[PDB]
Amino acid sequence: MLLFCPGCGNGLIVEEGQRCHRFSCNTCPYVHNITRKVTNRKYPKLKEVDDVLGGAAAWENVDSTAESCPKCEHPRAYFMQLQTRSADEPMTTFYKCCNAQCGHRWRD
């Protein structure tokens, strides 16, 4: 931790003496005896085990729609809405997702 000396006001470093280890410093004569036990408890933040990403549970969040896909004849469809500027003048684009045994992604 942080320990200072009361007489001078500077910090102390522990080093060996004659019969036992000593709390010494390099600014003023001041030594404290090291006795039965001195220790401090620290608690480093332990790591967490993270989540599995992906799956239909994640796709349950965004809302889907009812619209056929010309690949597997399913009304199953997720829709996405995005903004982007084309060459002439901006127009809102939309992404198409199939919620079936194939599950492909298109952009109209």
Binding site: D50, D51, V52, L53, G55, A57, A58, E60, N61
Partner: protein, 50 residues
């Protein structure tokens, strides 16, 4: 071929159709606030509460 302001006019039966949606949306969204404050909203993706 012409366009006027009469073309884009909300129907009387349409104003109350979206009123229901806005009310239900507000009632449903303003619950998750105190739901998070109490401590809830089990999370599927690896993410933070907000």
């Amino acid at each position: 071929f012409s366009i006027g302001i009469g073309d884009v006019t909300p129907g009387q039966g349409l104003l109350k159709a979206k009123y229901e949606l806005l009310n239900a949306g507000y009632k449903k969204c303003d619950e998750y606030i105190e739901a998070l404050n109490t401590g809830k909203l089990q999370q599927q993706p690896g993410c933070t509460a907000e």
